[PDB]
Amino acid sequence: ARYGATSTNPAKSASARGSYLRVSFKNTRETAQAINGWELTKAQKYLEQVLDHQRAIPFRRFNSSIGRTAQGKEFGVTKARWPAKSVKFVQGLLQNAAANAEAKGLDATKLYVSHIQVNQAPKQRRRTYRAHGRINKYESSPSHIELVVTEKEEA
Amino acid sequence: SHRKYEAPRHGHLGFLPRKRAASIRARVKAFPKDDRSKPVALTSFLGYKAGMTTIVRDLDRPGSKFHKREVVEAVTVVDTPPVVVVGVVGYVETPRGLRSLTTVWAEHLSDEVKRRFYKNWYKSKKKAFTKYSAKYAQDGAGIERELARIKKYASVVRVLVHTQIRKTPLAQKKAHLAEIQLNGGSISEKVDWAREHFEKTVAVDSVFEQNEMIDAIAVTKGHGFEGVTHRWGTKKLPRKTHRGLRKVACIGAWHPAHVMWSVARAGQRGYHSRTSINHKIYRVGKGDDEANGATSFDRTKKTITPMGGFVHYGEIKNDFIMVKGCIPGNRKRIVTLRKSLYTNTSRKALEEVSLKWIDTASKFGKGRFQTPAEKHAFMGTLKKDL
RNA sequence: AUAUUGGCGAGAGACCGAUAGCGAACAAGUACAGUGAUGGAAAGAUGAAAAGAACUUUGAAAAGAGAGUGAAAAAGUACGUGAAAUUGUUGAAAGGGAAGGGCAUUUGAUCAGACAUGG
RNA sequence: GUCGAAUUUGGGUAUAGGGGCGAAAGACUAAUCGAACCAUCUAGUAGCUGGUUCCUGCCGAAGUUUCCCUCAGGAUAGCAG
RNA sequence: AGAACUGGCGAUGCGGGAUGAACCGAACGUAGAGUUAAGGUGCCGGAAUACACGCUCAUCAGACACCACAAAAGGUGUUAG
RNA sequence: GCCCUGAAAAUGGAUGGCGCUCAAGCGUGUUACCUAUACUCUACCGUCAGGGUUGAUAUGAUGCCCUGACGAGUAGGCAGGCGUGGAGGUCAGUGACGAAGCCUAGACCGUAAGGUCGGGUCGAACGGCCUCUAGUGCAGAUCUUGGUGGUAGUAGCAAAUAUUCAAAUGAGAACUUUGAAGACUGAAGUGGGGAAAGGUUCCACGUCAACAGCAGUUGGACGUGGGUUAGUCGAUCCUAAGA
RNA sequence: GUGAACAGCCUCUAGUUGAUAGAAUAAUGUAGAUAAGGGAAGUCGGCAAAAUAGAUCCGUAACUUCGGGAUAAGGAUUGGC
RNA sequence: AGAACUGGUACGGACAAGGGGAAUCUGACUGUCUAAUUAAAACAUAGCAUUGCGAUGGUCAGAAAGUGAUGUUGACGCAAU
RNA sequence: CUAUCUAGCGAAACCACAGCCAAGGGAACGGGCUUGGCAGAAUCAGCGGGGAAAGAAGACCCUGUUGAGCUUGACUCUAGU
RNA sequence: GCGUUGGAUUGUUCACCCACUAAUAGGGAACGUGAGCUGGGUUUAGACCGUCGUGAGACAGGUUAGUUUUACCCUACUGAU
RNA sequence: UUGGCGGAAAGGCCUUGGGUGCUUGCUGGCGAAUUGCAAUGUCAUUUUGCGUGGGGAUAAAUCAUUUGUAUACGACUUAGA
Ligand SMILES: [Mg+2]
Ligand SMILES: [Mg+2]
Ligand SMILES: [Mg+2]
Ligand SMILES: [Mg+2]
Ligand SMILES: [Mg+2]
Ligand SMILES: [Mg+2]
Ligand SMILES: [Mg+2]
Ligand SMILES: [Mg+2]
Ligand SMILES: [Mg+2]
Ligand SMILES: [Mg+2]
Ligand SMILES: [Mg+2]
Ligand SMILES: [Mg+2]
Ligand SMILES: [Mg+2]
Ligand SMILES: [Mg+2]
Ligand SMILES: [Mg+2]
Ligand SMILES: [Mg+2]
Ligand SMILES: [Mg+2]
Ligand SMILES: [Mg+2]
Ligand SMILES: [Mg+2]
Ligand SMILES: [Mg+2]
Ligand SMILES: [Mg+2]
Ligand SMILES: [Mg+2]
Ligand SMILES: [Mg+2]
Ligand SMILES: [Mg+2]
Ligand SMILES: [Mg+2]
Ligand SMILES: [Mg+2]
Ligand SMILES: [Mg+2]
Ligand SMILES: [Mg+2]
Ligand SMILES: [Mg+2]
Ligand SMILES: [Mg+2]
Ligand SMILES: [Mg+2]
Ligand SMILES: [Mg+2]
Ligand SMILES: [Mg+2]
Ligand SMILES: [Mg+2]
Ligand SMILES: [Mg+2]
Ligand SMILES: [Mg+2]
Ligand SMILES: [Mg+2]
Ligand SMILES: [Mg+2]
Ligand SMILES: [Mg+2]
Ligand SMILES: [Mg+2]
Ligand SMILES: [Mg+2]
Ligand SMILES: [Mg+2]
Ligand SMILES: [Mg+2]
Ligand SMILES: [Mg+2]
Ligand SMILES: [Mg+2]
Ligand SMILES: [Mg+2]
Ligand SMILES: [Mg+2]
Ligand SMILES: [Mg+2]
Ligand SMILES: [Mg+2]
Ligand SMILES: [Mg+2]
Ligand SMILES: [Mg+2]
Ligand SMILES: [Mg+2]
Ligand SMILES: [Mg+2]
Ligand SMILES: [Mg+2]
Ligand SMILES: [Mg+2]
Ligand SMILES: [Mg+2]
Ligand SMILES: [Mg+2]
Ligand SMILES: [Mg+2]
Ligand SMILES: [Mg+2]
Ligand SMILES: [Mg+2]
Ligand SMILES: [Mg+2]
Ligand SMILES: [Mg+2]
Ligand SMILES: [Mg+2]
Ligand SMILES: [Mg+2]
Ligand SMILES: [Mg+2]
Ligand SMILES: [Mg+2]
Ligand SMILES: [Mg+2]
Ligand SMILES: [Mg+2]
Ligand SMILES: [Mg+2]
Ligand SMILES: [Mg+2]
Ligand SMILES: [Mg+2]
Ligand SMILES: [Mg+2]
Ligand SMILES: [Mg+2]
Ligand SMILES: [Mg+2]
Ligand SMILES: [Mg+2]
Ligand SMILES: [Mg+2]
Ligand SMILES: [Mg+2]
Ligand SMILES: [Mg+2]
Ligand SMILES: [Mg+2]
Ligand SMILES: [Mg+2]
Ligand SMILES: [Mg+2]
Ligand SMILES: [Mg+2]
Ligand SMILES: [Mg+2]
Ligand SMILES: [Mg+2]
Ligand SMILES: [Mg+2]
Ligand SMILES: [Mg+2]
Ligand SMILES: [Mg+2]
Ligand SMILES: [Mg+2]
Ligand SMILES: [Mg+2]
Ligand SMILES: [Mg+2]
Ligand SMILES: [Mg+2]
Ligand SMILES: [Mg+2]
Ligand SMILES: [Mg+2]
Ligand SMILES: [Mg+2]
Ligand SMILES: [Mg+2]
Ligand SMILES: [Mg+2]
Ligand SMILES: [Mg+2]
Ligand SMILES: [Mg+2]
Ligand SMILES: [Mg+2]
Ligand SMILES: [Mg+2]
Ligand SMILES: [Mg+2]
Ligand SMILES: [Mg+2]
Ligand SMILES: [Mg+2]
Ligand SMILES: [Mg+2]
Ligand SMILES: [Mg+2]
Ligand SMILES: [Mg+2]
Ligand SMILES: [Mg+2]
Ligand SMILES: [Mg+2]
Ligand SMILES: [Mg+2]
Ligand SMILES: [Mg+2]
Ligand SMILES: [Mg+2]
Ligand SMILES: [Mg+2]
Ligand SMILES: [Mg+2]
Ligand SMILES: [Mg+2]
Numbered sequence A: 001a002r003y004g005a006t007s008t009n010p011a012k013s014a015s016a017r018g019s020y021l022r023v024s025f026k027n028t029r030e031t032a033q034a035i036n037g038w039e040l041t042k043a044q045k046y047l048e049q050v051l052d053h054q055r056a057i058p059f060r061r062f063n064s065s066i067g068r069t070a071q072g073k074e075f076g077v078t079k080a081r082w083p084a085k086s087v088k089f090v091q092g093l094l095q096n097a098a099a100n101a102e103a104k105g106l107d108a109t110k111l112y113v114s115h116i117q118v119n120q121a122p123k124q125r126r127r128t129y130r131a132h133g134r135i136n137k138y139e140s141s142p143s144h145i146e147l148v149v150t151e152k153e154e155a
Numbered sequence B: 001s002h003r004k005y006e007a008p009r010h011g012h013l014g015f016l017p018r019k020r021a022a023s024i025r026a027r028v029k030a031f032p033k034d035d036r037s038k039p040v041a042l043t044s045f046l047g048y049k050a051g052m053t054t055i056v057r058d059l060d061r062p063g064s065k066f067h068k069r070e071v072v073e074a075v076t077v078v079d080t081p082p083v084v085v086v087g088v089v090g091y092v093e094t095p096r097g098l099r100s101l102t103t104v105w106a107e108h109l110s111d112e113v114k115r116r117f118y119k120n121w122y123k124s125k126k127k128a129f130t131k132y133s134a135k136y137a138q139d140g141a142g143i144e145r146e147l148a149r150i151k152k153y154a155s156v157v158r159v160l161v162h163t164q165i166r167k168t169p170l171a172q173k174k175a176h177l178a179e180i181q182l183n184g185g186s187i188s189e190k191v192d193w194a195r196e197h198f199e200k201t202v203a204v205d206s207v208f209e210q211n212e213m214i215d216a217i218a219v220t221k222g223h224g225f226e227g228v229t230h231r232w233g234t235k236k237l238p239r240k241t242h243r244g245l246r247k248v249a250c251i252g253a254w255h256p257a258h259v260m261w262s263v264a265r266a267g268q269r270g271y272h273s274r275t276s277i278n279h280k281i282y283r284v285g286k287g288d289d290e291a292n293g294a295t296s297f298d299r300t301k302k303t304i305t306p307m308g309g310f311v312h313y314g315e316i317k318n319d320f321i322m323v324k325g326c327i328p329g330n331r332k333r334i335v336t337l338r339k340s341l342y343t344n345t346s347r348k349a350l351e352e353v354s355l356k357w358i359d360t361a362s363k364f365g366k367g368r369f370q371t372p373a374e375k376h377a378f379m380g381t382l383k384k385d386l
Numbered sequence C: 001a002u003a004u005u006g007g008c009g010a011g012a013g014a015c016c017g018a019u020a021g022c023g024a025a026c027a028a029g030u031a032c033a034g035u036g037a038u039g040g041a042a043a044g045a046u047g048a049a050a051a052g053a054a055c056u057u058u059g060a061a062a063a064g065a066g067a068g069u070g071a072a073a074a075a076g077u078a079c080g081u082g083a084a085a086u087u088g089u090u091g092a093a094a095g096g097g098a099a100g101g102g103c104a105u106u107u108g109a110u111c112a113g114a115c116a117u118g119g
Numbered sequence D: 001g002u003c004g005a006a007u008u009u010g011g012g013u014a015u016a017g018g019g020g021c022g023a024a025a026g027a028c029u030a031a032u033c034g035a036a037c038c039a040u041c042u043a044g045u046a047g048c049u050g051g052u053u054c055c056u057g058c059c060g061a062a063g064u065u066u067c068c069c070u071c072a073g074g075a076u077a078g079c080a081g
Numbered sequence E: 001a002g003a004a005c006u007g008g009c010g011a012u013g014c015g016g017g018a019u020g021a022a023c024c025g026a027a028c029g030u031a032g033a034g035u036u037a038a039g040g041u042g043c044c045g046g047a048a049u050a051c052a053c054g055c056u057c058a059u060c061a062g063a064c065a066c067c068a069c070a071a072a073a074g075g076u077g078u079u080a081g
Numbered sequence F: 001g002c003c004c005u006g007a008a009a010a011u012g013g014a015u016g017g018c019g020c021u022c023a024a025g026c027g028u029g030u031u032a033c034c035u036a037u038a039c040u041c042u043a044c045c046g047u048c049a050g051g052g053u054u055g056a057u058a059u060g061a062u063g064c065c066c067u068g069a070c071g072a073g074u075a076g077g078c079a080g081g082c083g084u085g086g087a088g089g090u091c092a093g094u095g096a097c098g099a100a101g102c103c104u105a106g107a108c109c110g111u112a113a114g115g116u117c118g119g120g121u122c123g124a125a126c127g128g129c130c131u132c133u134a135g136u137g138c139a140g141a142u143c144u145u146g147g148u149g150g151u152a153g154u155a156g157c158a159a160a161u162a163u164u165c166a167a168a169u170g171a172g173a174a175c176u177u178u179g180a181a182g183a184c185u186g187a188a189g190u191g192g193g194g195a196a197a198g199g200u201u202c203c204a205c206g207u208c209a210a211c212a213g214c215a216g217u218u219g220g221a222c223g224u225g226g227g228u229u230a231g232u233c234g235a236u237c238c239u240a241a242g243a
Numbered sequence G: 001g002u003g004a005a006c007a008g009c010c011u012c013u014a015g016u017u018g019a020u021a022g023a024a025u026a027a028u029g030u031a032g033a034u035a036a037g038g039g040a041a042g043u044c045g046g047c048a049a050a051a052u053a054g055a056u057c058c059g060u061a062a063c064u065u066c067g068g069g070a071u072a073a074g075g076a077u078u079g080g081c
Numbered sequence H: 001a002g003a004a005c006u007g008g009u010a011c012g013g014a015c016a017a018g019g020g021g022a023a024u025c026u027g028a029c030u031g032u033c034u035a036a037u038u039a040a041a042a043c044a045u046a047g048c049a050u051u052g053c054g055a056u057g058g059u060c061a062g063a064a065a066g067u068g069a070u071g072u073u074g075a076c077g078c079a080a081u
Numbered sequence I: 001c002u003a004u005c006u007a008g009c010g011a012a013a014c015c016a017c018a019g020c021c022a023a024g025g026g027a028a029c030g031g032g033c034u035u036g037g038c039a040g041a042a043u044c045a046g047c048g049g050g051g052a053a054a055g056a057a058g059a060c061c062c063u064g065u066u067g068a069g070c071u072u073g074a075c076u077c078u079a080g081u
Numbered sequence J: 001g002c003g004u005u006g007g008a009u010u011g012u013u014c015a016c017c018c019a020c021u022a023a024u025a026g027g028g029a030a031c032g033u034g035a036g037c038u039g040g041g042u043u044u045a046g047a048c049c050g051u052c053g054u055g056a057g058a059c060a061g062g063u064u065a066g067u068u069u070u071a072c073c074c075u076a077c078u079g080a081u
Numbered sequence K: 001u002u003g004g005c006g007g008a009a010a011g012g013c014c015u016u017g018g019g020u021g022c023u024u025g026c027u028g029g030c031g032a033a034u035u036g037c038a039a040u041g042u043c044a045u046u047u048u049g050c051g052u053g054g055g056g057a058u059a060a061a062u063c064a065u066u067u068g069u070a071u072a073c074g075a076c077u078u079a080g081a
């Protein structure tokens, strides 16, 4: 309860959250944006064949010095990747929304992801040992994910 | 400040940028000056580089230690099946340079050529020139009046020919298509000649001939990213130098405070377009012939293909040009052969050669035998056979 | 009669208000450091009341989504208010080797000051 | 390099800071040595470097004189309010 | 490098000198209309490709104070004396 | 006089640029034209000066009013004001019917310091005026404490020969367990015990939030338990350098 | 086992197979090798690298503190049966 | 130790394992040190020489002492260079 | 074996604002100013020209009425004798 | 426009010889060029001599030994989408 | 609608034969106001979405896989109904 800005009709839609998840914030962001606005099954099937390395996730912000792939051509892009742990968690959340959408009587076949939004959770903090008896931070940058599925409108 | 000693710079600034070509088919950037008084001519010719071998022949060079003596030279054999004309293109003079005005295509286009226009031939609906041919159907007009305008405009006429790549051992089924300038008289007589040669064949011996110097336009064998030492030639830095020694030490003076366009940096080597000139024709091969590799002296019935096939290429079953020395590009790669842009009286250029012997031993190893006939006529009988 | 930054019992202040006031408002001379002498922190606030979310559903679980408690969950033992840097999303805009500023107006957005006369 | 001794080394024991210990390098004396470490005197002193927090109105300088172990500083007069 | 009188810069923006502490003009509350200064008016650029008499042709012309240099020496170029 | 020679330097470049040859060059003359925060007139702000005016005559005598002149400013002096914590006095001041605080290319007032309001958020307090008082105003001090960026999903996670098939278990298996294969340490050991030191790490069962810089169902981790048996092994006795 | 051997190399008992992993094999590296002809011309300098090497049997200079110098140098040989 | 036979003349076949010679400067040698930029020609050393001292003493320690090192010593000794 | 590309994991230096040149002037070597050349998203691997790059409030030198280690017929003293 | 070299001694720039050659021109680019090398010289700390100094120490006098750090950022340059 | 001409970027030009609206070459019959004395009063052409009806056509590219004439990654080059 109490999500980011939304314009969806709450009645034709249900939602899902994940907080404090130990996935990469930068990376899940890049994949969340990737399915943002997709029809649920389209998005679901794509994320599934990202894992299979048949196509990729465009990296458009947190992306410098990333490799170039042939698989980015689809999205007019040279840098893409296949961030499994991100896909995985995001998959997880797409499920639960799909779950909640069905318990709500929303027609599975009219669901697109109307909202998907990862910002960053509190950092975990580990030590690394650097030369000349020094210590440095070695932090995890966890993610909050949230998303919403909605029924497409007759028009 | 003023280098302690002088040396000439490394590398040639006239072959920049040392980047990869933008077509594996090197561009003929120049054609010969037209003499519109001679018959209608092809100016260049397509072909596939097949490999090299050795030659023997008496040198005719009055005043040389080696005059009237036998020399042994290296040659390259380029696989040259007849090419086929499938159109003619018309170029008009402008104050902005030559301009293609129209192109007119033949009515029937071989599958090889058609393949060239596709990226995914196999799953295609092969609709390549299907509507274009219809222009022919209506008795003429359409085509008839485009040849008409190439005739009244157009300062230069090129033909569109394509290789019959399938005659080649090459696996590539897609063929090679190129414009070739016509150099016989009068625009009109040119497009006429092209019209009449639609779907028809043209062979080398109708363009080139023995003792003729020709130029070779091909794309250099690539090598990918190269360090500065081999790429530019650059001295090796001493053994003791930290952080590597296949470098150059002083990438620049303090001022200009910019690495300069003219110092050696690592990058691509190979896969460049080169126009190599003055390669003299030692043999024009006939495919029908079975004495391709034979000689007035060495009479034995053998073809040009070495024992075991040209390595990484196959057998020469077609016509071929055999040229003195080496030409740019590697085996399997398309070459354009252009006739010279000038009339060289070099005396070397004018020498008429007669081959005395063509090496036909295996190249896949330290070959010992010219013909399997000869092998067996020396080895004896083996455990196999008889 | 005089002294009194110690000890015990008290009454007070135009003192400080959790980076302040004693180092310590808290299991503070604690946790931790150092062979040792010594050094020495951080750390207060759900709600009147736990009424600390029965139950259902998704999940391997953590949790999510409903439901429920409450004046409030825009108070969920991460908990009063919850600023800034910095961040995700959405919306508008601009962008030929920085951005930002001054005077001026186009354009778009936005906001005004009315005051009262006969049926 | 040396490798059967002026050998290597465990534990115990002794020497403690203007002191030790030194086959001598100002070496070593707990990552500290041309004087260890700890706390206190101690908010040590600085003619030198750095910073010094709101608005508007009005007036508005000096780098020159004299003396100074004076020359990156003061006193004195001038200029200023 | 060091003195002399005055005016500046420093402490001062503004118009000119492309540029710039110190030159020229001119010193400053918020503004309107006018006129100017020094400097400019082919175009960049507001403002006569104005008027008038000469001079100059450079296979290294020349083009404005401070100021971004030039000399002894020489020419049957051309002009006037 | 103008022009020519005399006249040689280092990235490519400078009458400011373009470009200009009866000039857009040089010398001279004559007109017009453009333009400063300067000059002229006027409004308004302030400063200073000079006056007028409470005789009884609704609400400012330190006030009202008339007139003239003037306005650069560092270091610096002075004046008048803005704002904060706390104190005396007064508005019988605001407030759970919403105090304070915070958010707001919404509004108004002031040259300004600032002041006032609306909307959202909030939830127990808090203002104005006269006065008192000071631990009273930050952009800087390689300032103090804390918190956060770009760097960046980047540097990197490459010493120490080497792993592979299959089953089991599990939500999940490159990494756990069993089986097989391939290998290593090669007794100067990667074997079997100990001294110093640690202090439960030992063993069993359960078990993965954190930690083991991939992973984890495994662990020297987490939870809960269990375990160290002496006349003869040591200490204990003795003396050593020393204390 | 080899061997002079507690060297190196391979093995038995025991113990491990633990050091993120996958795909590629550009430049430049780090570590390991080779190079025709010449042979220190490289360089401050043979730095680095190369060459020699066990054993048996011959042979062995100046000098000398008579002990040495000396594996001086320089040669031949080496399996299996 | 010797002999025959045998081989693509190989055979310490992996492993293991000195390059040599002629000289100048310098320290005799073995040994020592700047832990973490100097291993050396520097320190040490045997050897040589000097100095002081017969105990109510030489050299040295302690604030002082019925205090202490040499000294469980005695000039073939101790101390100092 | 790296680098490289992938999954997971994931720091640090440094950071006025930043990042194309030529000339001019200028605190006498500009990323910014003046006049010109010019100038088109977003990017990957390399590189050592420049960022008068980064790393320490310059060890050099001077100044300071600032030291300390050491030496001496400096000044002034002192254990001892 | 195009070239301007191979060597002996020296850390050297310079110098000076041998030798080849068409010629072995002179200069700049932060006395171009150390996150490009090298570290021979110079100029920390060890050490020998000589001169100087009573001494501690000094000496563009001779001598020997003496740690050469970071790029992953921007730009530039090379190549690549 | 009949002929021609135009390729420098022709994308336009000349010409034939009618049809048809207008004709201010000329002579008539009406109409205009109150839009209140200017403001404010002809609408030009770009695109881009939809809408009617008429003619018309019925493909590839990328991912993946594959070649090695290519290659750090992308990219390149082949192949597959
Ligand atoms: Mg949350
Ligand atoms: Mg980023
Ligand atoms: Mg990288
Ligand atoms: Mg980058
Ligand atoms: Mg991209
Ligand atoms: Mg580390
Ligand atoms: Mg350590
Ligand atoms: Mg030169
Ligand atoms: Mg190379
Ligand atoms: Mg070559
Ligand atoms: Mg090195
Ligand atoms: Mg061959
Ligand atoms: Mg009490
Ligand atoms: Mg506190
Ligand atoms: Mg604070
Ligand atoms: Mg505290
Ligand atoms: Mg301490
Ligand atoms: Mg509270
Ligand atoms: Mg709190
Ligand atoms: Mg729950
Ligand atoms: Mg509330
Ligand atoms: Mg609350
Ligand atoms: Mg709870
Ligand atoms: Mg809260
Ligand atoms: Mg965020
Ligand atoms: Mg209105
Ligand atoms: Mg010393
Ligand atoms: Mg120490
Ligand atoms: Mg320490
Ligand atoms: Mg103080
Ligand atoms: Mg004044
Ligand atoms: Mg005076
Ligand atoms: Mg005095
Ligand atoms: Mg000063
Ligand atoms: Mg003046
Ligand atoms: Mg000053
Ligand atoms: Mg002025
Ligand atoms: Mg000027
Ligand atoms: Mg004047
Ligand atoms: Mg201009
Ligand atoms: Mg004008
Ligand atoms: Mg002339
Ligand atoms: Mg003058
Ligand atoms: Mg004259
Ligand atoms: Mg000259
Ligand atoms: Mg000039
Ligand atoms: Mg003149
Ligand atoms: Mg004039
Ligand atoms: Mg005049
Ligand atoms: Mg004039
Ligand atoms: Mg004015
Ligand atoms: Mg003023
Ligand atoms: Mg006040
Ligand atoms: Mg007030
Ligand atoms: Mg107050
Ligand atoms: Mg206070
Ligand atoms: Mg704001
Ligand atoms: Mg409120
Ligand atoms: Mg409350
Ligand atoms: Mg007051
Ligand atoms: Mg204060
Ligand atoms: Mg601050
Ligand atoms: Mg600051
Ligand atoms: Mg990551
Ligand atoms: Mg990486
Ligand atoms: Mg590493
Ligand atoms: Mg390993
Ligand atoms: Mg398996
Ligand atoms: Mg493994
Ligand atoms: Mg083994
Ligand atoms: Mg061993
Ligand atoms: Mg267990
Ligand atoms: Mg881990
Ligand atoms: Mg884990
Ligand atoms: Mg346990
Ligand atoms: Mg073990
Ligand atoms: Mg590791
Ligand atoms: Mg090998
Ligand atoms: Mg060789
Ligand atoms: Mg030799
Ligand atoms: Mg040399
Ligand atoms: Mg030499
Ligand atoms: Mg030397
Ligand atoms: Mg040397
Ligand atoms: Mg060596
Ligand atoms: Mg070798
Ligand atoms: Mg060899
Ligand atoms: Mg002897
Ligand atoms: Mg034998
Ligand atoms: Mg010598
Ligand atoms: Mg010695
Ligand atoms: Mg020795
Ligand atoms: Mg050392
Ligand atoms: Mg040594
Ligand atoms: Mg050493
Ligand atoms: Mg002697
Ligand atoms: Mg990665
Ligand atoms: Mg940076
Ligand atoms: Mg510049
Ligand atoms: Mg210049
Ligand atoms: Mg200029
Ligand atoms: Mg300069
Ligand atoms: Mg700069
Ligand atoms: Mg300016
Ligand atoms: Mg500019
Ligand atoms: Mg650089
Ligand atoms: Mg840097
Ligand atoms: Mg000194
Ligand atoms: Mg003084
Ligand atoms: Mg003094
Ligand atoms: Mg001193
Ligand atoms: Mg000292
Ligand atoms: Mg004395
Ligand atoms: Mg004396």
Ligand SMILES: [Mg+2]
Pocket: J031
């Ligand atoms: Mg110079």
Ligand SMILES: [Mg+2]
Pocket: J031
């Ligand atoms: Mg230099």
Ligand SMILES: [Mg+2]
Pocket: none
């Ligand atoms: Mg450099």
Ligand SMILES: [Mg+2]
Pocket: J034, J068
């Ligand atoms: Mg360096």
Ligand SMILES: [Mg+2]
Pocket: J039
């Ligand atoms: Mg050096």
Ligand SMILES: [Mg+2]
Pocket: J039
């Ligand atoms: Mg040196």
Ligand SMILES: [Mg+2]
Pocket: none
């Ligand atoms: Mg020294």
Ligand SMILES: [Mg+2]
Pocket: J064
């Ligand atoms: Mg030396």
Ligand SMILES: [Mg+2]
Pocket: J065
């Ligand atoms: Mg050494």
Ligand SMILES: [Mg+2]
Pocket: J071, J072, J073
């Ligand atoms: Mg970096």
Ligand SMILES: [Mg+2]
Pocket: none
């Ligand atoms: Mg009509």
Ligand SMILES: [Mg+2]
Pocket: K038, K039
């Ligand atoms: Mg009007």
Ligand SMILES: [Mg+2]
Pocket: none
């Ligand atoms: Mg390959």
